[PDB]
Design a protein around this ligand. Sequence first.
Ligand SMILES: Cc1cc2nc3c(=O)[nH]c(=O)nc-3n(C[C@H](O)[C@H](O)[C@H](O)COP(=O)(O)OP(=O)(O)OC[C@H]3O[C@@H](n4cnc5c(N)ncnc54)[C@H](O)[C@@H]3O)c2cc1C
Length: 498
Amino acid sequence: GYVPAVVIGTGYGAAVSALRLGEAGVQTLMLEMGQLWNQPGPDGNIFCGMLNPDKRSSWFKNRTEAPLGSFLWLDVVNRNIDPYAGVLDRVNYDQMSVYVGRGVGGGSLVNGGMAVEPKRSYFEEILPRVDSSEMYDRYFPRANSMLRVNHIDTKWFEDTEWYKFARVSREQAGKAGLGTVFVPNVYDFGYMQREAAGEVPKSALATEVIYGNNHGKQSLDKTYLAAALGTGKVTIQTLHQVKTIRQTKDGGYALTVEQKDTDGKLLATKEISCRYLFLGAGSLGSTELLVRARDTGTLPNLNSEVGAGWGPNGNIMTARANHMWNPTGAHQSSIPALGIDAWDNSDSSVFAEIAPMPAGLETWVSLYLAITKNPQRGTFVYDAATDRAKLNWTRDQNAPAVNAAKALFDRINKANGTIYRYDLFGTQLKAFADDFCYHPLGGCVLGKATDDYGRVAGYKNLYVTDGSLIPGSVGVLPFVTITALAERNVERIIKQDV
Ligand SMILES: Cc1cc2nc3c(=O)[nH]c(=O)nc-3n(C[C@H](O)[C@H](O)[C@H](O)COP(=O)(O)OP(=O)(O)OC[C@H]3O[C@@H](n4cnc5c(N)ncnc54)[C@H](O)[C@@H]3O)c2cc1C
């Protein structure tokens, strides 16, 4: 049928947009291709954990996979599975694998909950056309509060076995003159203290994160989307994937939408039309829809910047072997609490998450997800033969990211007399994983493919709201930036356009 506003997807940009539209009295339909994660599964839990992956762990794969960094210990629990509408999608491109959430809440279902604002001077570097005082004075605070960001108790952190891994890396970095920072989170840290005391069901302390948290993590279905539904003006239809977008003869937008079951069988194809269309399908999904629409002629006025400017937030994974006297613990909370902040906006910049490992025995390994400043960008190019947007990114384009991560961790190895691990990512000696991404940024960059509020160039009442807006890098964990940017954008759009 027809509904005044449609939002595609239910991640960060989508959830902020639909809440504010509903509060403005605009009837709003969200279309999500994944599930509403609320049905107990065969173990009585909604989500599977990392030591017992099953079909819920994976979007249409026929075998489970180990979390990156942990194949040596967790391959033993991998199993063949039926392709199913599970929660984590590894999207393979030619020389890059991008990991994204699939379900009501998008990546908030599978991420580490880490909520960090970017460095103001870096924000000003990457988005010079955006007024940074309103961002820091109004929209970042608004996002932190609605997201339910909270802070770990420092005495509990210092004492608990569950964060020994973090303290070991803090000590080791400290000998190289590098400091750490506490990272705020949407995982309830009071709940986490109660897990460790045996008082409530464990989640972070029971090796859950990347296939969802059965407790503790305030994902978007609990914060923005719950509020959006509370407005009485928002509905969410799941297992509905938007395939094409066109501008209707009489105005507005029309969508073809496929409804599938959790086995991926096509149940129905529907046409849905609207006056205002908001894309929050993610860096990959929103960019694919628009490149497809441009190159198949359904949104012929889209510009040449649609598709461009993609980068993996400089993501590189690496690991260090600790001395035998520095064990990292068999019990590691699955929610990171500390990062190494060596980000000064120069090309040597690194902000590195001190990542837990789920093996559950002592391995002496310290794992890091480094965020780096690498100018290289890729482009999504539409392939009409398979009807897919392919990412034009090559592995050598991550050499600057690898070099910055290695120069930082080389300092730590030099100060401590330690070496890298070389065997965590595959048979060949490879200390740096350079062909994955958890933080895809770009494809519909703010001010290039769109105006400075995400209005798609060439079109009226057509908006992009999510990580595709960000120009490839934010120098920290990205979802607080995506949320705040979306707060700024939908407020303006409702005021001037709706
Ligand atoms: C393992 C991992 C850990 C991470 N840890 C952190 C962290 O701790 N902190 C942080 O800041 N960031 C983290 N990230 C990154 C963060 O999750 C993403 O940056 C964020 O979710 C991106 O939000 P978004 O709104 O752009 O899109 P997404 O959250 O990706 O949401 C897009 C939604 O649109 C749906 N969709 C896509 N295409 C269609 C279509 N055609 N029709 C219908 N629905 C559609 C998708 O199914 C999904 O639900 C993590 C990511 C991963 C994978």
